[PDB]
Amino acid sequence: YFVEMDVRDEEAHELASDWFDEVVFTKKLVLEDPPDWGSLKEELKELRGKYGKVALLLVTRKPSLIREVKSRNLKALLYVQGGDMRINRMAIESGVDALISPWFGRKDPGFDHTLAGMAARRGVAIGFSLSPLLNANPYGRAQILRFMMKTWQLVKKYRVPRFITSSAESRWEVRGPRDLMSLGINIGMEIPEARASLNFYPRTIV
Amino acid sequence: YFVEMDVRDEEAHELASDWFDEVVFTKKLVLEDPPDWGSLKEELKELRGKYGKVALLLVTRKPSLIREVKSRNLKALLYVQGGDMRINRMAIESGVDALISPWFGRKDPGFDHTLAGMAARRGVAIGFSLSPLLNANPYGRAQILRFMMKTWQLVKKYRVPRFITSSAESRWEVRGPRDLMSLGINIGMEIPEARASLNFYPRTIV
Amino acid sequence: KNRYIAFQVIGERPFKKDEIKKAVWEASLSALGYLGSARAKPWFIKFDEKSQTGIVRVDRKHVEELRFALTMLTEINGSKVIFRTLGVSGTIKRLKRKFLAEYGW
Amino acid sequence: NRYIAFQVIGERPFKKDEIKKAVWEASLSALGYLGSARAKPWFIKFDEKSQTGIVRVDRKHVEELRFALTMLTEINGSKVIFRTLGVSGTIKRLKRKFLAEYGW
């Protein structure tokens, strides 16, 4: 029983739905200041009726916006885009559902023993997204994979929840369950662990 | 105490001589029919006085030319270029000093359990040349390395003598002892075995 | 021992045998390099242009590597692609039956 | 980690930026981005006077990277030879044991 935890495009969602038992549509939300919570809840409710289970992805540089959206206590899974060591940090502290790709755009993993400790305590999952790898060049590929490896070593050590995902913004970025398990495995996951990143852990979250 | 077993260019010979204790100059000899044994012995004698130890490399398609040259019983190490399967086969049968790169230009190792048995019996060494790798493209690199791996597995099993070498036809193709041991090691040789391909085995031959 | 990976190919357009054969050696060459490629020993077997399904061979130890290499693929001759592995097997006999009978071979 | 000291023989002297780049190219073609990610190569320093440098790797993947650099042939249209002078667990021992002769 496999679960695609993050897809961000109607076309991608339907394709994943061939190969997955559960597909979570994700609303990408770029942010500088607070959003109209009327318009936002309305938009979120439509997606519940359209796609069933829904997630809200925050991409921002203001950490207070995490500790604001979170408070509104919306009827959707709360994701946050990684990259900004502030946002990474705040995301874990705020008890968010998952932090997506803490290494995004960085020259280092953007994740340490401490953040792992907090993530484990707060029950915050870590998203191992494929989409950046697809879009990166060989150098970048190698860099990202290194970051993913360190993150996994930590994630395994502190019993931190996690999943693997396409984070597909188009159908071309979509991959099947076993196709995604390759990423986990080659990052250092044993096969049973890589299966849990699609089965046991995502089940628990939704 | 390291030995470069095969270099084919004055410029290459002198460079190797910085990094090696013994460097065998090699006379590449392209062949269709018998050579003037007057001119050939003369040319070979000059090289003995110039470069000390000398080797004669046969590149041909007529296996009888191996059996003929060998019989002349010249004052030089007898090498033979691999590739043809006839030539590979004959070279081992004839008791030559070494067969150089049986996989050369092939789509397979050009070497089997039988040829290994004969090589071991007859005391015929196998030359693991780097020069083709340098000149090949990534696809070719991978192909050659596969062939080298199978050959090594056999070469190890039947206690077949062997060495690693540059087979440098110019100074740019030259590499140091440890640089060459990398090839052996990544083909499957343990470190002590890879050292013997430059030390123990080449000593025995010269 | 070798292992055989059956895969489906989703693309902007149908591809030909020559293109996929080539594309297999490109995914492996960038992902694993020529050394890693030499250790894994990938080998294109066949591709069914009708159903856009194929088979590729590898050493048993380096399956997940090659599965990763193909998922990592994006583009073949200026046309976006997706490789989906349908399954793995120790023989082309079991592979064709178990996973490719549907397409059907 | 482990540290590899190496010499660079070429047509031309070469600068820091070129070798840094070239280390990630040998590894990328030899080991690919996955193998590269497992080996974790990392350029440390290069001495332009003496054409010697240092590179870092995981201890398990030394011979891989040594092979990767021997496999190297051309840097920016100018033929090259990399020669490894030695290996060590620390830059302290490395500089003393193998690079004292050049600079350093």
Of the candidates B134, C35, B3, B136, the residue with the CA atom closest to the CA atom of residue D80: B134
Q: Extract the tokens encoding A172.
A: 């071309």
Looking at the complex, does the CB of residue A192 fall below 8 Å from at least one CB of chain C? no
Return the residue of B nearest to D72 by Cα: B134
> Per the CB < 8 Å rule, is A178 touching C83?
no
Q: Find chain B residues with C-beta within 8 A of D83's C-beta.
A: 19, 175-176, 179
DSSP state of C97: I
CA distance A118 to B108: 55
- What is the CATH classification number for the domain harbouring D91? 3.30.70.3250
D78-88 and D74-75 strand pairing: antiparallel
Whether residue C20 contacts residue C47, with contact meaning beta carbons closer than 8 Å, is answered with: yes
Looking at the complex, does the CB of residue B138 fall below 8 Å from at least one CB of chain C? yes
Whether residue B81 contacts residue B57, with contact meaning beta carbons closer than 8 Å, is answered with: yes
Nearest residue, CB atoms, D28 vs list A139, A145, A149: A139
Q: Extract the tokens encoding B165.
A: 């070498």
Whether residue A183 contacts residue A23, with contact meaning beta carbons closer than 8 Å, is answered with: no
Nearest residue, CB atoms, C82 vs list A141, A172, A180: A172
Q: Find chain B residues with C-beta within 8 A of C37's C-beta.
A: 138, 142
SS (H, E, C) chain B: CCEEEEECCHHHHHHHHHHCCEEEEEEEEEECCCCCHHHHHHHHHHHHHHHCCEEEEEEECCHHHHHHHHHHCCCCEEEEECCCCHHHHHHHHCCCCEEECCCCCCCCCCCCHHHHHHHHHHCCEEEEECHHHHHCCHHHHHHHHHHHHHHHHHHHHCCCCEEEECCECCHHHCCCHHHHHHHHHHHCCCHHHHHHCCCHHHHHHC
B77-81 and B98-100 strand pairing: parallel
What are the residues whose beta carbons fall under 8 Å from the beta carbon of A105, sequence distance 6 or more?
A83
Whether residue D7 contacts residue D83, with contact meaning beta carbons closer than 8 Å, is answered with: yes
> Per the CB < 8 Å rule, is D28 touching A149?
no
Q: What is the tally of structural domains in chain D?
A: 1
Whether residue A89 contacts residue A105, with contact meaning beta carbons closer than 8 Å, is answered with: no
Residue A175, Cα to own-chain centre: how many angstroms?
Answer: 15
Q: What are phi and psi of B190, to 5 degrees?
A: -75, 160
Q: Extract the tokens encoding A187.
A: 């990052």
CA distance B88 to B60: 11
Resolution (A): 2.8
Range of the domain at D48: 1-104
Helix B138-157 to helix B113-122 angle (10° resolution) is: 60
Q: Extract the tokens encoding C34.
A: 């020529």
- Domains assigned to chain B: 1-206 (3.20.20.140)
Interface test with B, best of C28, C29, C34 (most B CBs within 10 A): C34
Q: Give the DSSP H or E segment for A126.
A: strand A125-129
Q: How many CB pairs under 8 A join B and D?
A: 35
Nearest residue, CB atoms, D63 vs list B19, B141, B185: B185
Method by which this entry was solved:
X-ray
CA distance A176 to C7: 11
CA distance B31 to A18: 64
Q: Extract the tokens encoding A28.
A: 């990408």
CA distance B164 to B193: 11
CA distance B194 to A72: 66
Return the residue of C nearest to B140 by Cα: C34
Q: Find chain C residues with C-beta within 8 A of B144's C-beta.
A: 38
CA distance B155 to B144: 16
Angle at A191 between CA A187 and CA A196, to 5 degrees: 95
Whether residue B80 contacts residue B87, with contact meaning beta carbons closer than 8 Å, is answered with: yes
How distant is the Cα of B177 from the closest Cα of chain C, in angstroms? 20
> Per the CB < 8 Å rule, is A186 touching C65?
yes
Taking only residues 3 to 42 of chain C, the set having a beta carbon closer than 8 angstroms to any beta carbon of chain A reads: 30
Helix B86-93 to helix B113-122 angle (10° resolution) is: 30
What are the residues whose beta carbons fall under 8 Å from the beta carbon of D102, sequence distance 6 or more?
D47, D49, D50, D52
C75-76 and C79-89 strand pairing: antiparallel
Q: Find chain A residues with C-beta within 8 A of D24's C-beta.
A: 139, 142
Q: Extract the tokens encoding B77.
A: 């190490």
Categorise residue B99: left if φ over 0, alpha if ψ from -120 to 50, beta otherwise: beta
Looking at the complex, does the CB of residue B149 fall below 8 Å from at least one CB of chain C? yes
Which amino acid, one-letter code, is at B119?
Answer: A
CA distance B131 to B150: 19
Distances (CA, A) of B156 to A150, B113, B133, B149, B206: 38, 11, 22, 10, 21
- Contact: chain A with chain B (3+ CB pairs below 8 Å): no
HSE (side-chain half, CA atoms, 13 Å) at B144: 23
Q: Extract the tokens encoding B104.
A: 């050369």
Interface test with C, best of A129, A131, A179 (most C CBs within 10 A): A179
Q: Find chain C residues with C-beta within 8 A of B146's C-beta.
A: 38, 41
What are the residues whose beta carbons fall under 8 Å from the beta carbon of D15, sequence distance 6 or more?
D48
Beta-carbon count within 10 A of B159 CB: 10
| Residue showing tokens 């495009």 | A9
Q: Give the DSSP H or E segment for D17.
A: helix D16-30
Q: Extract the tokens encoding A17.
A: 């739905």
Looking at the complex, does the CB of residue C72 fall below 8 Å from at least one CB of chain A? yes
Q: In what order do the strands lie in the sheet with A98-100?
A: A3-7, A22-31, A54-60, A77-81, A98-100, A125-129, A162-165
